[PDB]
Amino acid sequence: MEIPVIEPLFTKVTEDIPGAAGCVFDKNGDFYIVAPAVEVNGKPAGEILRIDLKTGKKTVICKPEVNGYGGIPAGCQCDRDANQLFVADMRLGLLVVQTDGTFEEIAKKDSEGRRMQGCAGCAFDYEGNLWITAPAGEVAPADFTISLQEKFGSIYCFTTDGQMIQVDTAFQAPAGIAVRHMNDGRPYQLIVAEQPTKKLWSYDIKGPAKIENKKVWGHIPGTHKLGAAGMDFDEDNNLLVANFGSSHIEVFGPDGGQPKMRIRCPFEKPCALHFKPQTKTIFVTELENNAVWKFEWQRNGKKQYCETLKFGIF
Ligand SMILES: [Mg+2]
Ligand SMILES: [Mg+2]
């Protein structure tokens, strides 16, 4: 059982973005990168940037900061009803960021009164609930910590009613995250990457912030220390998963298990992925060259929540 590999042509899009992680298309087809970077001394110096795709030129729209504590934004999703970005920050929690660069911190505490943990990945379901991974410890002003060895990583659901609910915990560095939907649009499965354990986990989604039947859903190949990072579904509900401790993007079928195909990259350390809406084009961030690339996949992406806005014919 050798896993078949393809080597499509990758094209460089932009470069020199230290930590280039989360990326997203907004409702105008503009492209954003979050850059969870620090300065030499270690002070957070996170950034959210917009990329001109015909030129690769970059524009910093936001340097998140709260009480002089800098952000480490890592993951991002675009909203549906308003063109605004929900941003998962490893120092600041969940931010909502306008295209005009202004932002709001969403929650200092969760629904049980606990201080919020720093967040990394997030995925809207089609009902507008945001599922979030939190591999960091408490948000600032607490000292930064990371569940790369100890199991204090957590999962949240930020519901359409405005509740920040912790739905599971005791993960070792949860990273990427995605929601599988049935053909009729109902959220069905939550998939969570547990980065250093090489596991992808699945839950049955029974409602807003109600998940159960947790199980190991997929295995990430590779012998290195870090496995899965970012992930996204294609329109057939194949899950593409950046394998950080490698030069590959893994492709799982709807049934999980072992990858049914691997995509070899011209670089190590793939981090985040995102389809361009209505195209087969996948954008990939990677931390060997701190750069962004694109390549063509075999079919279009699964529509993100922000693509599901509909309007009465009147
Ligand atoms: Mg649990
Ligand atoms: Mg993505």
Author numbering: 1 to 314
The authors write:
Recently our laboratory has introduced a powerful mode of photochemistry into proteins, namely triplet energy transfer (EnT) photocatalysis, by developing an enantioselective [2 + 2] cyclase that relies on a genetically programmed benzophenone as a triplet sensitizer. Compared with benzophenones, thioxanthones have strong absorbance features that extend into the visible spectrum and are less susceptible to off-pathway processes that compromise EnT efficiency. Here, we develop engineered translation components to embed thioxanthone triplet sensitizers into proteins. This system enables the development of highly efficient and oxygen-tolerant photoenzymes that are powered by visible light and can achieve selective conversions that are beyond the reach of existing photocatalysts.
To identify a suitable starting point for enzyme engineering, we elected to reposition the thioxanthone sensitizer to position 244 to create a larger active site pocket to accommodate the sterically demanding substrate 2. After screening ∼3,200 clones, an optimized SpEnT1.3 variant was identified containing six mutations clustered around the active site (P23C, Y37A, Y121G, G226L S271C, H287L) that achieves a sixfold improvement in reaction yield (78% with SpEnT1.3 versus 13% with SpEnT1.0). SpEnT1.3 also displays a high degree of stereocontrol, preferentially affording (S,S)-2a with 99% e.e. and 22:1 d.r. Notably, improvements in photoenzyme efficiency and stereocontrol across evolution also coincided with a substantial reduction in side-product formation, with only ∼5% of 3 and 4 formed with SpEnT1.3. Despite promoting more challenging chemistry, detailed characterization of SpEnT1.3 reveals that this photoenzyme exhibits impressive kinetic properties that are in line with the thioxanthone-containing [2 + 2] cyclase VEnT1.3, with a kcat of 8.7 ± 0.64 s−1 (at 100% light intensity), a Km of <15 µM and a total turnover number of >300 under aerobic conditions. A 1.8-Å resolution structure of SpEnT1.3 shows how the active site pocket has been extensively remodelled as a result of sensitizer repositioning and the mutations installed during evolution, leading to a substantial increase in active site volume. Molecular docking of (S,S)-2a reveals a productive binding pose with the ligand occupying a tight binding pocket lined by Cys23, Pro36, Ile72, Met90, Gln195, Leu226, Cys271 and Leu287. Similar to VEnT1.3, the quinolone ring of the ligand lies in close proximity to the mTX sensitizer with its carbonyl forming a hydrogen bond with the Gln195 side chain, consistent with a reaction mechanism involving energy transfer from the excited sensitizer to the substrate. Mutation of Gln195 to Ala leads to a fourfold decrease in activity, confirming its importance to SpEnT1.3 photocatalysis.
